[PDB]
């Protein structure tokens, strides 16, 4: 939604451009546009969903 995608060893994070601040790649940290097949340099990953930790109760 803002900033950039980043990778660790094998974790991935999102951060703002101008100061490193690694956060989990959640749906509320991200947004969707189209299927993958168009995109140059995309990577397979898990996007975390915060709703299911709530609705499981």
């Amino acid at each position: 939604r803002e900033g950039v995608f980043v990778s660790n060893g094998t974790h991935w994070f999102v951060t703002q451009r101008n100061f490193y601040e690694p956060q989990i790649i959640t749906t509320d940290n991200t947004f969707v546009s189209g299927n993958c097949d168009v995109v140059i340099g995309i990577v397979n990953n898990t996007v975390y969903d915060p709703l299911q930790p709530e609705l499981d109760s």
């Binding site: 950039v4 451009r17 546009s33 189209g34 168009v38 995109v39 140059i40 340099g41």
Partner: protein, 50 residues
């Protein structure tokens, strides 16, 4: 100077003008081909007359 992939720099320069980053990657080859062709036209314009 911090290194950044050029296609990601373009995505921010799009973001800066109020076009959302996805619109670049959804069109990357077309954008590159326009840009490359346009630089050809620049060279031709400067070749044609002083």
């Amino acid at each position: 100077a911090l290194q950044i992939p050029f296609a990601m720099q373009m995505a921010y320069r799009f973001n800066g003008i109020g076009v959302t980053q996805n619109v670049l990657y959804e069109n990357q080859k077309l954008i590159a081909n326009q840009f490359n062709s346009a630089i050809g036209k620049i060279q031709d314009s400067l070749s044609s007359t002083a």
